[PDB]
Amino acid sequence: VDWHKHDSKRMLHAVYRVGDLDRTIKYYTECFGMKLLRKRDVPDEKYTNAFLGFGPENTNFAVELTYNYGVDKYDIGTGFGHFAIANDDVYKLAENIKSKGGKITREPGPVKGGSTVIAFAQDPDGYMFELIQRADTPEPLCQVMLRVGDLERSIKFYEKALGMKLLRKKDVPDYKYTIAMLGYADEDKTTVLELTYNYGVTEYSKGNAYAQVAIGTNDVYKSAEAVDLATKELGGKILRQPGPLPGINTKIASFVDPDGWKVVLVDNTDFLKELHLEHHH
């Protein structure tokens, strides 16, 4: 209810799995112009994380790659849409991606109409990146797009569970889809969650590739209460109850939305503590 007004939430990162960490890092840095921000090896649990993006994690959204030792392939499934990168010259960007050995699946040009210039690139594991031409972006990693079976239900869920704003809604009956942009700030200044409904399609597979999106909150207990209240009316479920993780002590909670997409809430202060320990110690 009123807690969302008092909280200061932020989209932190999308977490997903990759077959070859160095290869992805090279593709993102050379083709997409990302920076490698942080890398954490966790050999006791046979994984390595790498965080990449266009600005420091304390002010920007990132991608969090997970490499499970020896595991070289995953199943993306049908529900996962794409990540989007906004850039002021998509023709040049798509040419860069090709010249670095990357793959363009949809050549640069205006969309449906037109006239926004877009392109699509495909990464080594198969994840799609929409390239969107925007003149002066403050946050290039600008969308995570997921498919959903009931858009109204989802919009209400992200509003009530997570305090997101419905930023934009666009129905395109000519092509049998509707989209919504959800987030914590104006669409052109932030990373949005784009939810896509295809007419008469109510289920998709979650696969095992995409893991979750992480959202920072000033109180995981209060935010998890809000989520639990939402899930009672609309669907989804708390998975990990709010509390500190052993050792590091970062407070988190996790849940699934009405479609099965996974969200992790992270205590904002604890997240900054994590970043600090990596970078300054």
Is 64 flagged in the annotation as binding? yes
Is 177 flagged in the annotation as binding? yes
Q: Residues 197, 148: contact at Cβ < 8 Å?
A: yes
Cα(137)–Cα(212) distance, integer angstroms: 24
Is 130 flagged in the annotation as binding? yes
Is 147 flagged in the annotation as binding? yes
Encoding tokens for residue 180? 């919504």
- For the chain, the C-alpha Rg in angstroms (whole number) is 18
Is 156 flagged in the annotation as binding? no
Q: Which residues are catalytic?
A: 130
Q: Which residues, other chains included, contact 115 with Cβ-Cβ below 8 Å and sequence gap of 6+?
A: none
Cα(72)–Cα(21) distance, integer angstroms: 10
Closest CA to 194 of 174, 173, 214, 164: 164
Q: Which residues, other chains included, contact 209 with Cβ-Cβ below 8 Å and sequence gap of 6+?
A: 16, 17, 74, 75, 76, 77, 80, 125, 126, 127
- The residue type at 167: L
Is 134 flagged in the annotation as binding? no
Is 106 flagged in the annotation as binding? yes
In 10 A of CB 272, how many CB atoms?
Answer: 13
Reported as type and span, the H/E element at residue 49 is strand 47-53
Is 23 flagged in the annotation as binding? no
Binding residues for Zn(2+): 64, 82, 130
Binding residues for glutathione: 106, 112, 147, 177, 198
